[PDB]
Structure formats: C-alpha cells, structure tokens
Design a protein around this ligand. Sequence first.
Ligand SMILES: [Cl-]
Ligand SMILES: [Cl-]
Ligand SMILES: [Cl-]
Ligand SMILES: [Cl-]
Ligand SMILES: [Cl-]
Ligand SMILES: [Cl-]
Ligand SMILES: [Cl-]
Ligand SMILES: [Cl-]
Ligand SMILES: [Cl-]
Ligand SMILES: [Cl-]
Ligand SMILES: [Cl-]
Ligand SMILES: [Cl-]
Ligand SMILES: [Cl-]
Ligand SMILES: [Cl-]
Ligand SMILES: [Cl-]
Ligand SMILES: [Cl-]
Ligand SMILES: [Cl-]
Ligand code: NA
Ligand SMILES: [Pt+2]
Ligand SMILES: [Pt+2]
Length: 129
Amino acid sequence: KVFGRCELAAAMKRHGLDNYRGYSLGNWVCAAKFESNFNTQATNRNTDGSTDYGILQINSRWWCNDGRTPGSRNLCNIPCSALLSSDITASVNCAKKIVSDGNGMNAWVAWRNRCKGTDVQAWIRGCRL
Ligand SMILES: [Cl-]
Ligand SMILES: [Cl-]
Ligand SMILES: [Cl-]
Ligand SMILES: [Cl-]
Ligand SMILES: [Cl-]
Ligand SMILES: [Cl-]
Ligand SMILES: [Cl-]
Ligand SMILES: [Cl-]
Ligand SMILES: [Cl-]
Ligand SMILES: [Cl-]
Ligand SMILES: [Cl-]
Ligand SMILES: [Cl-]
Ligand SMILES: [Cl-]
Ligand SMILES: [Cl-]
Ligand SMILES: [Cl-]
Ligand SMILES: [Cl-]
Ligand SMILES: [Cl-]
Ligand code: NA
Ligand SMILES: [Pt+2]
Ligand SMILES: [Pt+2]
C-alpha cells in the first residue's frame, strides 16, 4: 500500500507513535517519507547481505527474520514479510523497540540525514489529526 501523507500520520497516531520516546508525529512521517516514500512494500538490499523492509526500512540484521541474513537476529520476533503489510501494526511495534534501543531515531540513517533538526511539523501540516 502507498499511504498518503496525512493518512499515514493518522495510522501512526492510532498505533501510538505520536510522541513515542519523545518523537513527534512529524518525525515519524518524515522518516517514512525518506525511507520508503510511504510504500509499505518497499524492500532494499544492503551491502552486507541484510535487507530493509517496509515503510520504515527495518533491517533483517537485527530486527526481523528473512532466512537469508547470516548471523543476524530477530529482536522484533517477526518474519520480515510482516513489515510489508498494508496494516502498519507490525512495523510500528518493531519501530518502538528500535527507537528504544539507545540512539533514538538516529537508528534510521535517512531520518538523521534528512529530518533531524528540520521543520518536521510540516509533514503533519493540514492533517485532521
Ligand atoms: Cl508527501
Ligand atoms: Cl488510524
Ligand atoms: Cl488505519
Ligand atoms: Cl482507522
Ligand atoms: Cl511534528
Ligand atoms: Cl548499510
Ligand atoms: Cl537469517
Ligand atoms: Cl522461520
Ligand atoms: Cl533474536
Ligand atoms: Cl514466519
Ligand atoms: Cl519467521
Ligand atoms: Cl519465516
Ligand atoms: Cl516462523
Ligand atoms: Cl516460517
Ligand atoms: Cl494501518
Ligand atoms: Cl490500520
Ligand atoms: Cl532520543
Ligand atoms: Na534477522
Ligand atoms: Pt485509519
Ligand atoms: Pt518463520
């Protein structure tokens, strides 16, 4: 599914992400924009052989199982395919664990390079929330 901007803001708020770990909704929407362009089915192979999945490009090295990432873990206890569903619950649940891991949203390199410190409220501007 390709979400619209305000549509994803609303879904993320219903699933408890707004202000989670102190990160406002616009930070989450901005991270999803640059990680996946709001497409739940986005997948991208990393240099190391791991793969990033879903709207928040969650990596199989640590977080999910795809069966083809040696030596990796599965800390969200999910198949990585769950992260490609039109229902964002598994991506949000797993993102909550990632953003609690110590480095906040810096775990998403596109957030650090494209969102951090910018006017992220623009991402929710206009949305009936
Ligand atoms: Cl947009
Ligand atoms: Cl919703
Ligand atoms: Cl929804
Ligand atoms: Cl709904
Ligand atoms: Cl915001
Ligand atoms: Cl990498
Ligand atoms: Cl694996
Ligand atoms: Cl398995
Ligand atoms: Cl594990
Ligand atoms: Cl499975
Ligand atoms: Cl599995
Ligand atoms: Cl599996
Ligand atoms: Cl399994
Ligand atoms: Cl399985
Ligand atoms: Cl949803
Ligand atoms: Cl939903
Ligand atoms: Cl933080
Ligand atoms: Na894994
Ligand atoms: Pt909804
Ligand atoms: Pt499995």
